[PDB]
Amino acid sequence: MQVILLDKVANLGSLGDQVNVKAGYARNFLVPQGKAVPATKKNIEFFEARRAELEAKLAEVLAAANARAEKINALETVTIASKAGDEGKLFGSIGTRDIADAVTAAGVEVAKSEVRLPNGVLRTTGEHEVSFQVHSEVFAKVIVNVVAE
């Protein structure tokens, strides 16, 4: 009933909770690979230095990552046919790769970990919408299309 997230994730706490938290939930998931926590003397005081010492990021860092929606919008139509066939369906797999990898059809590269589409995309050939989600502070816009061969 005592932890320190700091990297809030839908939990009733941000920058790490200092009062009664959940228990047995972190023993196998939260702590491992996720956001380590131990709100025990040692780890506690060590977090104060990360805060009592506190920003140029909101002015500068935000800018070195906000031009996303502006750098990629006027883009030429994405022409990556996903093997449209089967009497009116397809053969190609549409998920994470062809969405992001649709940028290096000339050179530029991205990270498959920024896509914004709750539901998986229906294996069609129409105007595949792609709302690029680089960071929470800034969102962008992309598209995808399938052809016959």
Partner: protein, 70 residues
Amino acid sequence: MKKDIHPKYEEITASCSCGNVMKIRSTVGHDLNLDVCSKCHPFFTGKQRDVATGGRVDRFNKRFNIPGSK
């Protein structure tokens, strides 16, 4: 048999009834495994209760710094 972290038990006793049974009782505790070590990753110890709850106030590390050392 194990409960490694803590000793164990398996000591016998007589299970009396209404006055008396000169029978015998024994085997207790239990088991479980697969414990994720903050370090590399889990070797499955077969601790039990009083062993599992022990790995809590304690560590996971010191709770193992013995089944190795000694």
